[PDB]
Amino acid sequence: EKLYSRVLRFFGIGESHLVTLLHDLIAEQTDPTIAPYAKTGEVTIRLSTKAHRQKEADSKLDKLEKKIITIDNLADYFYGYGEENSLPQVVFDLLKEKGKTITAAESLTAGLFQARLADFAGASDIFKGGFITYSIEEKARMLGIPFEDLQLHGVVSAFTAEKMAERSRQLTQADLAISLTGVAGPDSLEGQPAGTVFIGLSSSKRTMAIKVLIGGRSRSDVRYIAVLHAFNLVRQTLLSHKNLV
Amino acid sequence: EKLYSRVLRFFGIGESHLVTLLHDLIAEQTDPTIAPYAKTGEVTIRLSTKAHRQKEADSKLDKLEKKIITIDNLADYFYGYGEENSLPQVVFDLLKEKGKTITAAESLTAGLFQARLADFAGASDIFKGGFITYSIEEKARMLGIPFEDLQLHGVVSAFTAEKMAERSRQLTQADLAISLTGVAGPDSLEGQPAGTVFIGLSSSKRTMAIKVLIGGRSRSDVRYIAVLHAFNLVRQTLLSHKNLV
Numbered sequence: 001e002k003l004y005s006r007v008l009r010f011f012g013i014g015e016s017h018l019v020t021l022l023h024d025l026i027a028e029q030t031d032p033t034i035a036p037y038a039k040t041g042e043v044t045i046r047l048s049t050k051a052h053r054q055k056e057a058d059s060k061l062d063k064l065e066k067k068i069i070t071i072d073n074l075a076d077y078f079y080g081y082g083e084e085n086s087l088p089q090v091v092f093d094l095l096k097e098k099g100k101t102i103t104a105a106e107s108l109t110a111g112l113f114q115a116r117l118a119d120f121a122g123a124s125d126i127f128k129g130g131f132i133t134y135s136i137e138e139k140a141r142m143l144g145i146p147f148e149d150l151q152l153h154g155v156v157s158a159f160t161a162e163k164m165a166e167r168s169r170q171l172t173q174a175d176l177a178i179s180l181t182g183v184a185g186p187d188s189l190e191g192q193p194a195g196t197v198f199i200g201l202s203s204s205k206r207t208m209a210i211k212v213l214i215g216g217r218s219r220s221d222v223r224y225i226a227v228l229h230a231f232n233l234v235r236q237t238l239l240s241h242k243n244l245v
Numbered sequence: 246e247k248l249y250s251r252v253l254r255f256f257g258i259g260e261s262h263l264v265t266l267l268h269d270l271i272a273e274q275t276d277p278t279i280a281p282y283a284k285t286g287e288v289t290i291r292l293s294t295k296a297h298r299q300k301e302a303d304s305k306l307d308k309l310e311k312k313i314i315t316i317d318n319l320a321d322y323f324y325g326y327g328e329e330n331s332l333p334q335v336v337f338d339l340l341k342e343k344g345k346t347i348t349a350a351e352s353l354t355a356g357l358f359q360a361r362l363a364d365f366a367g368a369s370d371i372f373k374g375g376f377i378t379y380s381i382e383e384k385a386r387m388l389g390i391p392f393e394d395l396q397l398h399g400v401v402s403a404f405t406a407e408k409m410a411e412r413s414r415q416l417t418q419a420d421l422a423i424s425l426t427g428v429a430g431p432d433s434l435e436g437q438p439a440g441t442v443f444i445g446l447s448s449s450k451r452t453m454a455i456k457v458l459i460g461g462r463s464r465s466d467v468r469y470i471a472v473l474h475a476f477n478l479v480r481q482t483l484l485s486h487k488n489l490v
């Protein structure tokens with residue numbers, strides 16, 4: 001008999017919060033065993049059971065996974081399976097599955113989002129290119145956003161996130177466009193504290209932006225975690241059944 | 246007794262070739278010590294000598310260093326010192342020191358070069374933004390390169406690398422522009438093998454391109470190493486006392 005495992009991957013809930021929900025079934029567990037593991041920007045849960053064949057183990061792993069997912073809104077945070085899966089891999093597969101293309105305009109991440117897209121073979125089917133608008137002048141110049149408007153609202157704002165996404169979509173005619181603008185830290189920017197990030201998303205149907213706070217993190221961690229927030233926003237939009245793309 | 250160390254950092258030569266050039270010196274060196282080390286993209290040599298003062302230690306570390314750098318073309322590959330140092334860090338400091346700004350147009354690296362620039366605090370002083378031209382369509386549209394010529398020469402060509410660098414410099418008004426186009430792999434393109442990368446560099450004085458071969462490497466390593474080749478090209482141009490920028 002071999003040890004079979006299954007890894008559940010979650011984004012949007014901290015490892016300290018998720019296990020408080022779970023401890024009912026962690027303090028009660030038997031077989032499969034449950035083991036949570038946190039990493040930069042996300043958390044996972046390892047289920048482990050003994051069985052003779054992958055079919056038998058899958059059947060027991062499925063029952064405990066159903067218990068976990070239905071708790072609270074964990075279905076909103078669970079995004080995939082696998083020791084190596086990641087939000088960018090899930091989004092890449094989802095983009096190819098739905099025949100959509102994506103572009104981006106990045107400031108503080110400065111290319112990390114689009115570089116993660118190119119990590120996967122065949123990315124050219126879903127990604128044709130994008131923009132790194134690191135200055136206010138290049139946000140205006142590259143994308144065609146009025147310079148005064150950027151100055152008035154600030155580059156760290158929902159307005160600027162929405163405009164970067166809408167204009168980069170219109171310049172590339174990709175199906176979706178992501179924008180990332182915020183404060184890498186540690187200094188505040190425009191009165192916005194370190195870790196404040198606005199992430200825009202634009203399709204032909206709608207343009208919107210989310211505001212996230214990645215507080216208490218290094219420069220590199222804010223940029224890295226902001227990329228995951230952007231990929232998760234794409235994931236939710238593609239999985240939504242609401243004609244969003 | 247106190248241990249005093251010095252780390253020499255090299256780019257453009259592999260571990261096998263470096264150790265071969267150093268064979269005679271290493272076989273005859275007892276104090277200071279000599280230890281070569283390698284990782285993806287670069288190689289280092291650590292020298293150790295003991296003394297309870299640096300002027301005594303630095304004097305013999307200096308004589309071992311001179312013997313090393315005078316071997317063959319190792320002066321061409323040596324780029325800096327320090328256990329925690331890097332080629333992007335050295336090039337970043339050089340851009341600040343010389344008061345030069347830089348932009349980029351990236352295809353296969355897809356933003357890794359510009360994302361590496363933003364790793365350093367104050368990157369906004371020397372970097373205002375750039376382009377990710379992942380497709381032949383966006384190479385033409387974003388940079389204004391005549392399409393017929395891109396298809397004629399091929400996207401993996403010195404011609405295309407030169408045009409990408411020249412156009413991105415002219416669109417941003419930056420002092421320098423880097424371009425990266427090549428065969429990420431693992432299977433060939435345009436009859437060129439995987440790892441074939443053309444790297445353009447444009448100033449108002451001159452536009453040129455180099456060709457590098459990163460063969461037998463995975464996609465991610467090709468992109469990672471291509472980024473370093475681009476940084477080294479910037480380094481050599483800024484250090485060249487030849488009216489190149």
Ligand SMILES: [Cl-]
Pocket residue numbers: 005006007008081082083
């Ligand atoms: Cl799994």
Ligand SMILES: [Cl-]
Pocket residue numbers: 107108109180181182183
């Ligand atoms: Cl930003």
Ligand SMILES: [Cl-]
Pocket residue numbers: 250251252253326327328
């Ligand atoms: Cl050193």
Ligand SMILES: [Cl-]
Pocket residue numbers: 257258259262
């Ligand atoms: Cl070599």
